[PDB]
RNA sequence: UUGAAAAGAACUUUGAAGAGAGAGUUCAAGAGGGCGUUCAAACGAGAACUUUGAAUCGGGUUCAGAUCCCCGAAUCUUGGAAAGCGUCGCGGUUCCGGCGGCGUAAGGGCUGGGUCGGUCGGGCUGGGGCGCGAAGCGGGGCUGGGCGCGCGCCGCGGCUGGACGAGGCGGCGACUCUGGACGCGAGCCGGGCCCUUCCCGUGGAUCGCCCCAGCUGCGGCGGGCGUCGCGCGGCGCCUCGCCUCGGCCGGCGCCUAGCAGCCGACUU
RNA sequence: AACGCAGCUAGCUGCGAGAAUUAAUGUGAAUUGCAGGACACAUUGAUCAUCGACACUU
C-alpha cells in the first residue's frame, strides 16, 4: 500500500497540493508519454511537455494521427494548445481548444542542452533499477 | 544593454554612481511619458528601469558592507550591526569557552575516578 | 510714497544706484514725475510746463523714461 | 445639392490634375532617394514641390482651393504610416536595404488624390531583393490587385476584406487590425461607407454594412505586416492633424484660440503638419488642448516589433457606370522581389491570374463589345 | 438647451443677481456654447445678455404724504398710537430749552447787557422752570434792567 | 577666613563633564540620503488648468514628495534643469500628493523649460 | 455550485431602450452569467415636473481658489486716474476672447446792529515788454498736369491636358472641340510720387493783456430835457432812483420796551 | 497599528521610497485579464521555489 508515515493518503489534502501548487512543480504534473519507437532511441518513458515540440492527441474529440506541434503551454489552467487543433467560434474568428498533457503522445522531441540532462538523468536511473535483480 | 548584477561587481564606485544617476533620469522621463497618454513600449519599461535601479544599489551596498567586515575583523569592538544577530536570548547565552568551565575541585574528581566501561555477565 | 516738494533733491533721489525707473504723467493742469526706488515711489508734482520739458532733458542716462501721456 | 458629383467633365479633369501632379512628384521623389537622404528634407522637398506647382497652375483665378491635401509621410521598416518629422525631431539618415514608404496627397477644389508606395533603398540594377521583405511586399501588392479587381458595384466591404485575409495568410503575413480605406467626396477626405480589414468584434459589430454604388470615388490603403498585424504607437509624436468641422467648443486658453484661428485662416478641414507654423512651440501647446477636446483628429504614427517589415499601397479609384477605374498607381516593378511564398489558393490564383492579362489597355474591354453579336 | 451654467456666470460678470439677467430666447444656441467668462463678456457687448433695470419702488405715494404731514394733515387725535412721551421725549424738550436759554443768557454777558450779578442770578432762574420760552426770558430782562437802572436814578 | 559662605543655601557645585569619545561607532556606515533630487520631484502636471500657468503666469507645476519643503523644492528644480526659480508655493492635495507651483525667473521662460522636459 | 471545454450566444428583424422573434454553440439552454400657478418656444423618442421668455491692502483674474495667483502700493493732498464704474462709438466673430469718446397761533439758528476823511486789498491811466489771423519763413500732404504702376474689363493668337464619333474574324492607328497657362491689341478704367498750389508750426507790428511809473477811487444802470444814425446802436446834465468796491486807522458817528435780512426743523 | 508601492488596481494578498521586490543558490522555458519587453537556454537563464547576502518610511 503505502508504508510512509510522512506522505498522506488524504483526499482533500492531495487535491490542495494540486490545485494551488506552485508553477515549477506544476511543470512536471503536466507530463506526457512518448511513442513506442522513441522509448527505444532513448531509454525514457515520459517527459515534461515543452513549448514547441510535435505531439498528437490520442483520446477525445480531436483524436487523430496528425502530428501537430505544441504552440502554447498554459500551466495556470493545466492545458496545452495544438496548432491544427482549433475550433470555429460562432463569430467567425477561430480559437484553440486546450487538452490535457496526459492525453497526448510526443513523437518529436525539442532537444537542446537542458533536455539532454533530464533525458540522460532519467536514462541512467533505469539501468540502476536492473542491477537490483541479480 | 543588459544590466547584469554579477557584471557590475568588479567596478569602482564612480561608475556605479555614474550608471545609477542616469538610470534615475530615464525613470523620471517615463513618468513624464505616463501623464501624457504614453505607449506600452515606454510604460512596460518603468518596471525594467526600477528593478535595474534596485539592482545597481544592492551591488553598491553589498560591496560597501563587505569592506566594513574586512576592516573590523581583528577588533575588540565592532559596530552594533557588524556583530551577529541570531536572536536575543541566544546572545545572552554564555560563550563557548565559559559554557563548560570546571573548578579545580571538579577536574580532580574526574581525573581520579573516570567512568569505566564495565560489563556484567550472567 | 513720499512727495518731494523741491526739484533739486529730486535729481539726486533719481540718480541713486537703486532707482529703477521714471514714469512721467502729464495731467491737464500739471506734470507728475514718479521715480521708483527700492522702498519708495517718490513723486514730484510741478505745474510750470516750460520746466517739465527742461526736467525730462535733465535726467541721468541708463534710467528708464517711459512716459504715461 | 450644390456640390457637384463626377457627372461633369471638369470634375474628372481636376481628379486627373491632382493624380498626375501626385504621380509626377512621387516618381521624382522616389528617384531622388539614396542611402542617406534626410527624411525631414524629403518631407520639405515634397511639400515644396506641391506648393511650387500649385503656385504654377490656375493662378488667374484667385479663389480656387488647391494644394497640399495630405502631407508627405516617409516611414521606415518597422514603422507603419504617417511619419512626417519635425525640426526638433530626430531624423533618420537612410541606408542600403531599408523599406521606405512614401505617402502624399493633393487636392483641387475640394477633390482629393492620395497615393502611397513601398520599396527598398538602393537595391542595385543587377542585384535583387529576397526574403521576408519580398514576402510582405508581394503580399501587399497582391492585396492591392485584389482590391483593384474585387471592388465592383454591388459588393460589400466583406468580400475584399476576407480575400485580403486569404492573400496575406497565403503569404503567411497579416493585415493590421482596424484600418479604414476611405470614401472621398467634395472637401470630405473621409465619409462613412469605407473598407475595414481584420476587425475586432466591437469594431465589426459597429461597422455598418454597405454596398459599392455608382459615381463613387474611393481611396484604398493596404498595410500588410510581416509579423502579427497588431500595430500600436510607441510614444512617437503625432505631427499630422485634421480639423473636424461639426465640433463646436470655445477654447479657454489664448494660445489654442490663436492656433485654431490660424488653422481656419490657412486650411479649412484639410490635413496638415506642424512644420508649417515654424514657431512650433506655441503650436504644440495649443494642439494639446485642441486634440483633447476633439477639435483635431490626429494621424497617429504606429510601429511594430523590432525586425518587422510592413508594406503599404494606397491608390484612389473612380466608379463610372463602366465600373471602377484606376487613376493613380505607385511606380512598382513586381519582378525584383523574389518571394518563395505566394498565394496558393487555386480559385484565388485564377482570380488574381485573370486580371494580369487584363491590364493591357483600357479600351480593349469596350472594343470587343461590338464583336459580341458578330458571330 | 439647459442654461443653468450660463445664467450663473452672467450674474457674476454683471455683478448682479440672477433675477436681473436676461438671456435672449431667440439666439439660444449662441448663448448655450459659452463655457467661460470672456465668452460671456463677448455676448454682453454684442447685446444678447442684458442686465435688466431695477424694479420700481417709487416714493411718490409716500412723499406727497410727507408734504402733507409736514403741514399736519394726518396727525389728529386718532392717528397717533404712542404716548406723548414716546412720540417726542420730554427729556429732550428740557434738554433743548436749557440749550436755548443758557446760550442766549450767555449772549448777554459778553455783549454787556447784563452784569455777572444778574447773570448768575438769572441762570438759576432758568434752571427752576421760571421762563417758559425765549420771548419770555428776553423781555423779563428788559423790565428787570429798567427798574435796576432806575435804582441808579 | 578662607572657607567662607555668605550664601545661606548649599547649592550643588559644578563638576566637570567630559564629552563622548567612544571606542567604536554605533552604526556601521552613515546612511545614504534617500530624499535626494531625483526623489523630490515625481512628475509634472499636464492638466488644462495647469496650462493657464506656463504662458499666462510663467510657472511650472510639479508633483513633489510630501516630505519636501520649499527650499528642497527650489534646490531641486535648479539642480535638475540648470534654471532659476523665483518663488515656490505648495498645497497638499486631497488625493494625498503635494502640488508645487514653482515659478521661474523672469529672465527665463517656462514655455521653453517645458520644451526640454516634454509636457509641451 | 454554468458547462468537458466559453465553444458566453455571429448574422437578420421590431423597439430609443430594457426586452423580444428566427439563427447559431452544446449530448443538453427543460445548463443563458446568483446559470446542476398660467401661457408660448426649444432639446428630446418621450414634457404637469427640465431650460429660456412673459404675467496687508487696492484692482484684475477661474468651469471650480483667492486679503494666498498676477499687477501695483506698502510694513485736503502723495497712492490718484494711467485703476474702477456709468454711457457712447468703431473693428471683429474660437487671432477677433481687441480699442477710443465724454462723465464721475406758539416753539429756532446765522450775519451786519451806522456818519465822514487818512492807510491798504485795490479799481484806473501813461512809457516799455508778452500772445497772434495776415504779408512772410521751415515746410507735411485727399488738390490742378506728367511717369513706372493694377500683373484688370473686353476681344484675338499659339502651345498643352481632357473628352468624343468611327472600325476590324484577343489586335491598333488616323480626324475635331474645349479647359489650364502665356503672349498680344494701353480699346477701357483704379492706386502712389515731383512744381506753384491746399494745408499747419515760429519771430516782429495792430489788436487783447502784463511789468515799471501816477491817486485811494473806478467801472456801470434808470426817468425828464437834447434827440443823430451806418443787424448794430449811441450821447451830456439833475435825480426825493443808484451800487457810493471793500477792510484798518482817525475829527468823525451811538440800536438801548431791540431791529433788518437770510436760512431751518419737526411738533402741540 | 498607520500610511505608501502594479502599465491598466478598488478588496484580499505580498512588500517598504531597492517598495506584488534586489542579490545569491537550485530549477530550466515561461507569466497571463489585456498589452509590452526580455529570454543563443553555455558569451548564462523566463519562471517558480528556497533564503544564508543587502535593504527595511511613521
Amino acid at each position: 500500500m503505502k508504508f510512509n508515515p510522512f506522505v498522506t493518503s488524504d483526499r482533500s489534502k492531495n487535491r490542495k497540493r494540486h490545485f494551488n501548487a506552485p508553477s515549477h512543480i506544476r511543470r512536471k504534473i503536466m507530463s506526457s508519454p512518448l511513442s513506442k519507437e522513441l522509448r527505444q532511441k532513448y531509454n525514457v518513458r515520459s517527459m515534461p511537455i515543452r513549448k514547441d515540440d510535435e505531439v498528437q492527441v490520442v483520446r477525445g474529440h480531436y483524436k487523430g494521427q496528425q502530428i501537430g506541434k505544441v504552440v502554447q503551454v498554459y500551466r495556470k489552467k493545466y492545458v496545452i494548445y495544438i496548432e491544427r487543433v482549433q475550433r470555429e467560434k460562432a463569430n467567425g474568428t477561430t480559437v484553440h481548444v486546450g487538452i490535457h498533457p496526459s492525453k497526448v503522445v510526443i513523437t518529436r522531441l525539442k532537444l537542446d542542452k537542458d533536455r539532454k540532462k533530464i533525458l540522460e538523468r532519467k536514462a541512467k536511473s533505469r539501468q540502476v533499477g536492473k542491477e537490483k535483480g541479480k | 544593454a543588459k544590466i547584469k548584477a554579477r557584471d557590475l561587481r568588479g567596478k569602482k564606485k564612480e561608475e556605479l554612481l555614474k550608471q545609477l544617476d542616469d538610470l534615475k533620469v530615464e525613470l523620471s522621463q517615463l513618468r513624464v511619458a505616463k501623464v501624457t497618454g504614453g505607449a506600452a513600449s515606454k510604460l512596460s519599461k518603468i518596471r525594467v528601469v526600477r528593478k535595474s535601479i534596485a539592482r545597481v544599489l544592492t551591488v553598491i551596498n553589498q560591496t560597501q558592507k563587505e569592506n566594513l567586515r574586512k576592516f573590523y575583523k581583528g577588533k575588540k569592538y565592532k559596530p552594533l550591526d557588524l556583530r551577529p544577530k541570531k536572536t536575543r536570548a541566544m546572545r545572552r547565552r554564555l560563550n563557548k569557552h565559559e559554557e563548560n568551565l570546571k573548578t579545580k575541585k571538579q577536574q580532580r574528581k574526574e581525573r581520579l575516578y573516570p567512568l569505566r566501561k564495565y560489563a556484567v555477565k550472567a | 510714497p513720499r512727495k518731494i516738494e523741491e526739484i533739486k533733491d529730486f535729481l539726486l533721489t533719481a540718480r541713486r544706484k537703486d532707482a529703477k525707473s521714471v514714469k512721467i504723467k502729464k495731467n491737464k493742469d500739471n506734470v507728475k514725475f514718479k521715480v521708483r526706488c527700492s522702498r519708495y515711489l517718490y513723486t514730484l508734482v510741478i505745474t510750470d510746463k516750460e520746466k517739465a520739458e527742461k526736467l525730462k532733458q535733465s535726467l541721468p542716462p541708463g534710467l528708464a523714461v517711459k512716459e504715461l501721456k | 445639392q450644390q456640390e457637384q458629383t463626377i457627372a461633369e467633365d471638369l470634375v474628372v479633369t481636376k481628379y486627373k490634375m491632382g493624380g498626375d501632379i501626385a504621380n509626377r512628384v512621387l516618381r521624382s521623389l522616389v528617384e531622388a532617394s539614396s542611402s542617406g537622404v534626410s527624411v525631414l528634407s524629403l518631407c520639405e522637398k515634397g511639400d515644396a514641390m506641391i506648393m511650387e506647382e500649385t503656385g504654377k497652375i490656375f493662378k488667374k483665378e484667385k479663389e480656387m482651393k488647391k494644394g497640399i491635401a495630405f502631407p508627405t509621410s516617409i516611414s521606415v521598416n518597422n514603422c507603419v504610416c504617417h511619419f512626417s518629422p519635425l525640426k526638433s525631431d530626430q531624423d533618420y539618415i537612410l541606408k542600403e536595404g531599408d523599406l521606405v514608404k512614401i505617402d502624399l496627397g493633393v487636392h483641387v477644389d475640394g477633390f482629393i488624390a492620395n497615393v502611397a508606395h513601398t520599396f527598398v533603398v538602393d537595391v542595385a540594377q543587377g542585384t535583387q531583393v529576397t526574403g521576408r521583405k519580398a514576402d510582405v511586399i508581394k503580399a501587399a501588392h497582391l492585396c492591392a490587385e485584389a482590391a483593384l479587381r474585387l471592388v465592383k458595384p454591388g459588393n460589400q466591404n466583406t468580400q475584399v476584406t476576407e480575400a485580403w485575409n486569404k492573400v496575406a495568410h497565403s503569404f503567411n503575413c497579416t493585415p493590421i487590425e482596424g484600418m479604414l480605406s476611405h470614401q472621398l467626396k467634395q472637401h470630405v477626405i473621409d465619409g462613412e461607407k469605407t473598407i475595414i480589414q481584420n476587425p475586432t468584434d466591437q469594431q465589426k459589430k459597429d461597422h455598418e454594412k454597405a454596398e459599392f454604388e455608382v459615381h463613387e470615388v474611393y481611396a484604398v490603403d493596404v498595410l500588410v505586416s510581416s509579423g502579427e498585424g497588431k500595430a500600436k504607437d510607441a510614444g512617437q509624436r503625432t505631427t499630422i492633424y485634421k480639423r473636424d468641422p461639426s465640433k463646436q467648443y470655445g477654447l479657454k486658453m489664448k494660445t489654442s484660440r490663436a492656433f485654431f484661428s490660424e488653422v481656419e485662416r490657412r486650411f479649412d478641414a484639410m490635413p496638415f503638419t506642424l512644420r508649417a507654423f515654424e514657431d512650433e512651440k506655441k503650436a504644440r501647446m495649443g494642439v494639446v488642448e485642441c486634440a483633447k477636446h476633439e477639435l483635431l483628429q490626429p494621424f497617429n504614427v504606429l510601429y511594430e516589433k523590432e525586425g518587422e517589415f510592413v508594406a503599404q499601397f494606397k491608390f484612389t479609384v473612380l466608379l463610372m457606370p463602366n465600373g471602377p477605374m484606376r487613376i493613380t498607381s505607385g511606380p512598382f516593378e513586381p519582378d525584383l522581389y523574389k518571394s518563395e511564398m505566394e498565394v496558393q489558393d487555386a480559385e484565388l490564383k485564377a482570380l488574381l491570374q485573370s486580371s494580369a492579362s487584363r491590364k493591357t489597355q483600357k479600351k480593349k474591354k469596350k472594343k470587343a463589345s461590338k464583336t459580341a453579336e458578330n458571330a | 438647451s439647459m442654461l443653468r451654467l450660463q445664467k450663473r456666470l452672467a450674474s457674476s460678470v454683471l455683478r448682479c443677481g440672477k433675477k436681473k439677467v436676461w438671456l435672449d430666447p431667440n439666439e439660444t444656441n449662441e448663448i448655450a456654447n459659452a463655457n467661460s467668462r470672456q465668452q460671456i463678456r463677448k455676448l454682453i457687448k454684442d447685446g444678447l445678455i442684458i442686465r435688466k433695470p431695477v424694479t420700481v419702488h417709487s416714493r411718490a405715494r409716500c412723499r406727497k404724504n410727507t408734504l402733507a404731514r409736514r403741514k399736519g394733515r394726518h396727525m389728529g387725535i386718532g392717528k397717533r398710537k404712542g404716548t406723548a412721551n414716546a412720540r417726542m421725549p420730554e427729556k429732550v424738550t428740557w434738554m433743548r430749552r436749557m440749550r436755548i436759554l443758557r446760550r442766549l443768557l450767555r449772549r448777554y454777558r459778553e455783549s454787556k447787557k447784563i452784569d455777572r450779578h444778574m447773570y448768575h442770578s438769572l441762570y438759576l432762574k432758568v434752571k427752576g422752570n421760571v421762563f417758559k420760552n425765549k420771548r419770555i426770558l428776553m423781555e423779563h430782562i428788559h423790565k428787570l434792567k429798567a427798574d435796576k437802572a432806575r435804582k441808579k436814578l | 577666613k578662607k572657607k567662607i559662605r555668605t550664601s545661606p543655601t548649599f547649592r550643588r557645585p559644578k563638576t566637570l563633564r567630559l564629552r563622548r569619545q567612544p571606542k567604536y561607532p554605533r552604526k556601521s556606515a552613515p546612511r545614504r540620503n534617500k530624499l535626494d533630487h531625483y526623489a523630490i520631484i515625481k512628475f509634472p502636471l499636464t492638466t488644462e488648468s495647469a496650462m493657464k500657468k506656463i504662458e499666462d503666469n510663467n510657472t511650472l507645476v510639479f508633483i513633489v514628495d510630501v516630505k519636501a519643503n520649499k527650499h528642497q523644492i527650489k534646490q531641486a528644480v535648479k539642480k535638475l534643469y540648470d534654471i532659476d526659480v523665483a518663488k515656490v508655493n505648495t498645497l497638499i492635495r486631497p488625493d494625498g500628493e503635494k502640488k508645487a507651483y514653482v515659478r521661474l525667473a523672469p529672465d527665463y521662460d517656462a514655455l521653453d523649460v517645458a520644451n526640454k522636459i516634454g509636457i509641451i
Side-chain angles (χ1 to χ4, degrees):
Chain A
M1 193 184 286
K2 184 261 292 178
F3 304 108
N4 202 168
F6 292 103
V7 304
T8 63
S9 176
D10 207 75
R11 178 173 176 84
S12 67
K13 286 193 287 184
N14 284 316
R15 291 175 57 83
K16 184 181 176 295
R17 271 73 166 272
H18 178 267
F19 286 99
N20 56 19
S23 78
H24 73 284
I25 303 168
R26 187 187 284 264
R27 162 245 169 79
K28 68 189 286 187
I29 275 90
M30 294 172 66
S31 296
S32 57
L34 277 306
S35 71
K36 292 181 182 291
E37 74 93 19
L38 198 56
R39 293 177 187 172
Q40 295 301 108
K41 282 175 92 286
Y42 306 103
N43 196 356
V44 186
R45 185 171 174 89
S46 67
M47 202 172 182
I49 203 70
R50 184 65 172 83
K51 169 68 176 297
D52 286 327
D53 50 355
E54 286 83 356
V55 79
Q56 67 176 356
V57 192
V58 304
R59 293 285 187 270
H61 177 75
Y62 298 96
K63 175 173 69 176
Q65 293 83 243
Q66 300 297 110
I67 308 298
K69 69 191 291 185
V70 182
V71 76
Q72 190 175 3
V73 174
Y74 189 64
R75 295 171 183 172
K76 179 64 179 293
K77 290 178 74 177
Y78 286 111
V79 93
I80 61 172
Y81 290 170
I82 314 298
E83 280 192 352
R84 274 79 57 91
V85 178
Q86 291 187 357
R87 183 257 318 280
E88 179 67 28
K89 169 75 172 180
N91 192 10
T93 184
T94 311
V95 300
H96 287 93
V97 170
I99 51 178
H100 193 272
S102 65
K103 305 295 192 293
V104 293
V105 305
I106 292 177
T107 63
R108 183 65 53 83
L109 189 58
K110 191 259 187 292
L111 188 71
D112 51 358
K113 182 265 305 296
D114 281 332
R115 309 301 294 274
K116 290 172 69 177
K117 305 285 179 62
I118 191 65
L119 193 63
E120 283 286 333
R121 180 75 185 274
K122 291 177 182 290
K124 189 177 77 72
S125 294
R126 284 169 67 103
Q127 284 93 19
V128 178
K130 299 296 188 289
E131 290 195 357
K132 288 179 74 71
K134 292 178 183 178
Chain B
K2 300 301 290 186
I3 177 71
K4 291 184 186 290
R6 51 144 159 30
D7 191 3
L8 297 171
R9 288 183 180 273
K11 291 182 180 180
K12 301 292 185 288
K13 296 190 291 290
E14 293 85 4
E15 67 271 23
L16 290 175
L17 266 69
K18 182 174 76 171
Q19 199 175 5
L20 180 63
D21 61 358
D22 56 354
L23 283 173
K24 297 183 75 67
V25 169
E26 287 101 17
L27 178 58
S28 63
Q29 294 179 1
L30 296 175
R31 293 168 180 172
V32 174
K34 191 172 74 68
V35 297
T36 62
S41 70
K42 303 294 182 181
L43 296 188
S44 65
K45 197 184 264 80
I46 290 177
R47 185 177 296 171
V48 174
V49 180
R50 286 173 68 247
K51 309 293 107 171
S52 299
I53 293 172
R55 186 170 293 114
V56 178
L57 283 172
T58 296
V59 175
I60 293 169
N61 293 325
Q62 290 184 356
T63 307
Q64 178 186 5
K65 184 72 74 71
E66 185 188 5
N67 301 319
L68 274 298
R69 305 284 185 182
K70 292 291 183 182
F71 176 67
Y72 293 102
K73 182 180 185 291
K75 302 296 183 69
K76 182 71 179 295
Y77 307 113
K78 296 184 292 293
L80 289 175
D81 55 353
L82 296 174
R83 56 185 66 179
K85 194 252 175 66
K86 174 56 73 175
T87 185
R88 182 171 185 175
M90 287 172 69
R91 296 192 298 268
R92 306 290 179 269
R93 189 172 301 180
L94 297 61
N95 69 42
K96 192 63 178 182
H97 183 272
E98 67 182 357
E99 183 273 358
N100 60 1
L101 288 183
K102 296 182 288 183
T103 51
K104 191 175 263 77
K105 186 174 186 178
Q106 179 58 254
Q107 61 190 0
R108 284 180 63 250
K109 272 74 181 173
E110 295 179 354
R111 186 178 67 243
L112 293 176
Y113 304 102
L115 182 68
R116 300 290 302 278
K117 182 182 178 182
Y118 60 95
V120 173
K121 66 174 71 174
Chain C
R2 303 297 184 188
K3 184 176 182 177
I4 304 170
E5 190 185 3
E6 301 294 331
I7 292 96
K8 184 67 180 68
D9 51 356
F10 178 77
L11 286 175
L12 52 86
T13 200
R15 69 183 68 254
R16 294 185 299 175
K17 182 69 174 67
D18 55 355
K20 289 172 95 288
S21 66
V22 178
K23 297 191 287 185
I24 303 99
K25 189 161 190 173
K26 300 178 179 67
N27 293 326
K28 275 76 178 173
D29 54 347
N30 57 10
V31 179
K32 292 184 181 183
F33 289 91
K34 298 176 174 67
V35 52
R36 174 79 262 171
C37 296
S38 294
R39 185 173 168 86
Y40 287 110
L41 179 67
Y42 296 101
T43 305
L44 179 65
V45 175
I46 194 68
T47 63
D48 295 330
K49 293 178 73 68
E50 78 272 14
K51 285 166 88 283
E53 60 180 0
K54 289 178 175 66
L55 181 54
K56 292 175 95 290
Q57 185 174 0
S58 301
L59 286 175
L63 188 66
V65 289
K66 181 185 283 186
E67 289 83 4
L68 284 218
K69 153 132 212 159
Chain D
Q1 193 275 123
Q2 289 301 110
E3 62 272 20
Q4 67 266 17
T5 62
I6 60 169
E8 285 80 5
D9 199 0
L10 184 58
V11 181
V12 180
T13 300
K14 292 180 188 295
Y15 275 90
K16 182 179 178 181
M17 201 75 202
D20 279 335
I21 196 166
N23 284 318
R24 190 189 73 86
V25 182
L26 176 61
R27 264 77 174 179
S28 178
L29 196 146
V30 168
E31 190 185 4
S33 294
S34 69
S35 300
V37 180
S38 178
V39 171
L40 177 59
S41 67
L42 286 175
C43 291
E44 292 176 358
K45 182 254 186 67
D47 295 338
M49 289 183 72
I50 294 169
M51 187 63 204
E52 189 177 2
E53 204 177 5
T54 304
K56 288 181 183 178
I57 62 170
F58 291 90
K59 82 282 191 186
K60 293 182 181 296
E61 301 174 357
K62 274 76 67 177
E63 296 290 325
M64 186 182 290
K65 291 181 181 178
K66 48 184 177 292
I68 304 99
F70 179 71
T72 305
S73 301
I74 307 300
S75 294
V76 207
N77 302 323
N78 296 114
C79 182
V80 177
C81 63
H82 298 164
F83 184 74
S84 71
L86 298 174
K87 293 295 187 180
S88 180
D89 200 357
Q90 190 180 6
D91 193 78
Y92 176 68
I93 287 95
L94 293 171
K95 183 64 175 65
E96 173 69 33
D98 292 337
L99 186 148
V100 163
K101 295 178 284 184
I102 299 171
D103 190 359
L104 78 160
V106 176
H107 68 91
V108 179
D109 204 3
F111 298 98
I112 303 167
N114 286 322
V115 53
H117 189 72
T118 302
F119 63 96
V120 178
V121 171
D122 288 332
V123 57
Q125 287 79 17
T127 67
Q128 293 178 355
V129 186
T130 59
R132 195 178 298 276
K133 297 179 188 177
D135 290 326
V136 70
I137 288 169
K138 291 182 71 67
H141 194 261
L142 285 181
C143 293
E145 267 102 10
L148 184 64
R149 275 85 167 87
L150 271 75
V151 171
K152 68 183 179 181
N155 293 329
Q156 298 177 359
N157 42 9
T158 301
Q159 285 79 14
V160 184
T161 292
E162 292 180 351
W164 283 346
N165 285 314
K166 299 285 103 175
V167 172
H169 290 87
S170 298
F171 280 91
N172 304 113
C173 293
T174 305
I176 293 172
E177 297 176 356
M179 286 178 60
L180 294 176
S181 297
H182 287 294
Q183 178 170 13
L184 294 176
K185 282 183 178 179
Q186 199 272 336
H187 284 292
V188 177
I189 198 168
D190 44 355
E192 292 174 351
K193 192 183 271 85
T194 54
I195 292 171
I196 199 71
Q197 83 276 21
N198 201 358
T200 63
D201 47 1
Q202 292 188 0
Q203 73 185 1
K204 71 181 182 68
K205 189 176 181 181
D206 297 335
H207 187 198
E208 191 181 5
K209 295 175 175 64
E211 181 183 359
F212 292 97
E213 293 293 328
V214 188
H215 299 92
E216 202 177 11
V217 179
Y218 282 183
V220 176
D221 192 0
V222 170
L223 273 161
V224 170
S225 174
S226 67
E228 295 176 353
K230 184 178 179 180
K232 194 180 285 184
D233 53 354
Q236 188 63 42
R237 187 168 181 111
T238 299
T239 71
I240 300 172
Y241 293 90
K242 65 173 284 291
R243 177 191 170 286
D244 195 358
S246 64
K247 303 294 182 67
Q248 184 64 59
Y249 183 74
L251 299 173
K252 295 178 184 289
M253 182 176 174
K254 288 181 186 173
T255 300
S256 300
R257 294 198 305 268
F259 180 75
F260 191 74
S261 297
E262 186 177 2
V263 169
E264 293 293 321
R265 292 172 296 172
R266 294 180 67 240
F267 26 72
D268 194 75
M270 290 294 173
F272 68 102
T273 186
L274 291 177
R275 287 179 293 164
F277 293 95
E278 81 189 2
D279 197 81
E280 61 180 3
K281 294 178 180 179
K282 302 177 79 70
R284 289 192 308 182
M285 197 162 276
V287 81
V288 170
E289 183 185 0
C290 293
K292 185 60 69 178
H293 294 285
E294 302 292 327
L295 292 176
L296 295 174
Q297 191 176 6
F299 284 174
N300 295 318
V301 179
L302 303 173
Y303 291 97
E304 281 188 352
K305 315 284 187 171
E306 184 179 1
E308 286 295 325
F309 298 100
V310 183
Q312 188 172 2
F313 294 102
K314 185 185 284 186
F315 61 92
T316 50
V317 67
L318 274 72
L319 271 291
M320 296 298 294
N322 287 317
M325 181 180 74
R326 195 270 309 278
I327 189 170
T328 179
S329 67
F332 195 70
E333 180 178 358
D335 297 327
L336 189 61
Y337 292 101
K338 184 256 178 65
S339 177
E340 294 180 355
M341 284 62 69
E342 58 193 3
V343 180
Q344 297 296 318
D345 187 73
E347 299 176 357
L348 194 60
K349 281 186 180 295
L351 184 62
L352 296 173
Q353 180 182 357
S354 65
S355 67
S357 179
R358 177 71 271 171
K359 48 188 182 183
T360 60
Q361 294 184 359
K362 292 180 179 180
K363 293 179 179 179
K364 292 180 179 179
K365 58 181 184 178
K366 186 177 180 180
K367 182 179 179 180
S369 176
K370 298 173 185 176
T371 68
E373 302 179 0
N374 277 355
Chain E
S1 178
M2 186 269 289
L3 303 167
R4 287 202 293 266
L5 185 64
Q6 284 74 239
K7 184 71 75 70
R8 179 176 62 80
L9 277 76
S11 63
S12 292
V13 302
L14 268 59
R15 306 292 176 89
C16 65
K18 295 183 287 294
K19 290 171 93 285
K20 262 57 183 295
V21 172
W22 183 80
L23 272 70
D24 198 356
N26 296 320
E27 286 85 3
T28 297
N29 197 5
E30 293 294 327
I31 300 170
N33 53 8
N35 57 179
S36 60
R37 300 294 184 91
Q38 288 180 356
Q39 195 174 4
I40 289 297
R41 297 186 183 96
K42 190 177 176 67
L43 297 170
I44 299 157
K45 71 177 179 180
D46 287 331
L48 281 79
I49 296 169
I50 295 169
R51 190 175 184 176
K52 293 191 280 189
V54 289
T55 176
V56 285
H57 187 195
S58 69
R59 286 180 56 85
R61 287 194 287 186
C62 69
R63 187 183 292 173
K64 181 257 180 183
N65 295 317
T66 303
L67 268 291
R69 295 187 190 95
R70 189 73 185 273
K71 296 174 72 68
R73 290 294 184 274
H74 296 295
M75 295 301 174
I77 204 67
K79 300 293 283 184
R80 52 168 71 104
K81 287 188 183 294
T83 59
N85 196 2
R87 299 188 74 204
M88 184 60 72
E90 296 295 325
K91 182 173 177 64
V92 179
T93 302
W94 173 259
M95 193 259 194
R96 182 176 292 165
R97 294 175 64 243
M98 301 303 285
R99 258 64 165 264
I100 295 166
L101 267 66
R102 288 170 181 165
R103 183 172 58 242
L104 177 131
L105 197 64
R106 283 185 286 110
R107 286 184 175 94
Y108 287 176
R109 190 181 64 187
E110 75 261 10
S111 179
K112 283 89 174 66
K113 280 89 175 63
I114 55 172
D115 47 355
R116 295 181 304 169
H117 308 287
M118 195 188 295
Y119 168 73
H120 191 78
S121 176
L122 287 177
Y123 196 79
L124 302 175
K125 298 289 286 182
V126 168
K127 175 71 175 295
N129 193 31
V130 179
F131 295 143
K132 185 171 73 70
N133 46 5
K134 191 176 79 174
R135 68 183 71 179
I136 290 295
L137 166 60
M138 192 182 290
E139 76 267 12
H140 179 263
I141 292 173
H142 298 295
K143 185 178 92 276
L144 200 281
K145 180 195 263 75
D147 285 334
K148 188 182 282 190
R150 183 256 185 185
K151 291 179 178 67
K152 304 299 185 290
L153 179 63
Chain F
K1 292 182 183 180
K2 277 79 178 173
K3 279 82 173 176
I4 192 63
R5 287 180 181 269
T6 58
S7 179
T9 302
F10 184 82
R11 199 175 70 176
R12 183 182 63 84
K14 59 189 294 181
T15 62
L16 186 140
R17 290 180 178 174
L18 292 170
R19 288 182 181 176
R20 289 184 182 265
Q21 47 185 356
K23 298 291 183 74
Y24 70 104
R26 295 296 177 268
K27 293 183 261 76
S28 176
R31 65 175 180 86
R32 179 179 53 80
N33 192 3
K34 289 173 73 177
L35 193 67
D36 56 347
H37 298 96
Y38 294 112
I40 292 294
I41 298 169
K42 292 184 283 186
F43 58 91
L45 281 176
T46 56
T47 62
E48 190 172 359
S49 66
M51 298 297 170
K52 306 296 287 294
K53 305 293 285 183
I54 294 99
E55 294 89 354
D56 301 331
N57 207 358
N58 194 6
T59 169
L60 294 167
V61 46
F62 301 101
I63 293 298
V64 303
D65 195 1
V66 182
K67 295 183 288 185
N69 57 355
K70 293 176 179 175
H71 294 89
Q72 284 169 347
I73 297 165
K74 181 182 281 191
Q75 288 177 355
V77 180
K78 184 177 263 75
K79 188 71 175 174
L80 268 67
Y81 308 113
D82 289 333
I83 57 177
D84 301 331
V85 170
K87 68 175 180 61
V88 190
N89 296 322
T90 57
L91 60 90
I92 295 177
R93 59 190 296 166
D95 194 8
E97 287 86 5
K98 192 168 181 178
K99 179 169 70 176
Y101 288 108
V102 42
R103 182 182 181 181
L104 304 184
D107 181 75
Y108 287 159
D109 46 355
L111 191 72
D112 293 334
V113 179
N115 191 6
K116 187 260 183 180
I117 296 167
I119 64 171
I120 197 161

